[PDB]
Design a protein around this ligand. Structure first.
Ligand SMILES: NC(=O)c1ccc[n+]([C@@H]2O[C@H](COP(=O)([O-])OP(=O)(O)OC[C@H]3O[C@@H](n4cnc5c(N)ncnc54)[C@H](OP(=O)(O)O)[C@@H]3O)[C@@H](O)[C@H]2O)c1
Ligand SMILES: Nc1nc(=O)c2nc(CNc3ccc(C(=O)N[C@@H](CCC(=O)O)C(=O)O)cc3)cnc2[nH]1
Length: 159
């Protein structure tokens, strides 16, 4: 099955031209936990912002152009990305906006981090209808000396 993992602020904002104005190490540990040892699919833009291959994961990059890094797998379409994943229990789609939009309709689970932050952004997670999903797990956390804003982890299963 296919799952999407994303961190969203209010208004579903997930990205902007500059780095996000937040520091959430706990959210990053959550991302790592949920993605280790699974293939992760991402768009070229996301790849660039990440900067290097995520360790302990099969990295698949979507791009209309020829790949520029032989350490990861590059594909030219959604179908080819799925196939490059092989026979695995769970495929994780890590963004960005374009990518999420194309995989949402095919996903069975969403791992979302809701951040209590208002930011101007130019990229949004796709709108989803709550009633179409079941919240199977949720856990709120307040900001702390290490995390700049409060946040909530939620796992949704498609009904
Ligand atoms: N807060 C979060 O959870 C989170 C998670 C991920 C990303 N983000 C952010 O979101 C941004 C990136 O989102 P984005 O929408 O701009 O970019 P994106 O989805 O990462 O990448 C878009 C690129 O992927 C390729 N692509 C997408 N669909 C394709 C398809 N069907 N076939 C071939 N290539 C395809 C194209 O690459 P070419 O241009 O090379 O053709 C396209 O320009 C950044 O701000 C980033 O930090 C946030
Ligand atoms: N929950 C969630 N939070 C995010 O920040 C997020 N970011 C992306 C894309 N951007 C990134 C940026 C950096 C790293 C990153 O460096 N991750 C390392 C973490 C090392 C650590 O724990 O700092 C990794 O190994 O996962 C991952 C995705 C996709 N889904 C998300 N999902």
């Amino acid at each position: 099955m296919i799952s999407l993992i994303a961190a969203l602020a209010v208004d579903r904002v997930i990205g902007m031209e500059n780095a996000m104005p937040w520091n959430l190490p706990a959210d990053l540990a959550w991302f790592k936990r949920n993605t280790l040892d699974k293939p992760v699919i991402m768009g070229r833009h996301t790849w660039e912002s990440i900067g290097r291959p995520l360790p302990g994961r099969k990295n698949i990059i979507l791009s209309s152009q020829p790949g520029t890094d032989d350490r990861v797998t590059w594909v030219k379409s959604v179908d080819e990305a799925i196939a490059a994943c092989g026979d695995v229990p769970e495929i994780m789609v890590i963004g960005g906006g374009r990518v999420y939009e194309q995989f949402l309709p095919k996903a069975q689970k969403l791992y979302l981090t809701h951040i209590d932050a208002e930011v101007e952004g130019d990229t949004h997670f796709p709108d989803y209808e709550p009633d179409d999903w079941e919240s199977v797990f949720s856990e709120f956390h307040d900001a702390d000396a290490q995390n700049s804003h409060s946040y909530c982890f939620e796992i949704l299963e498609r009904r």
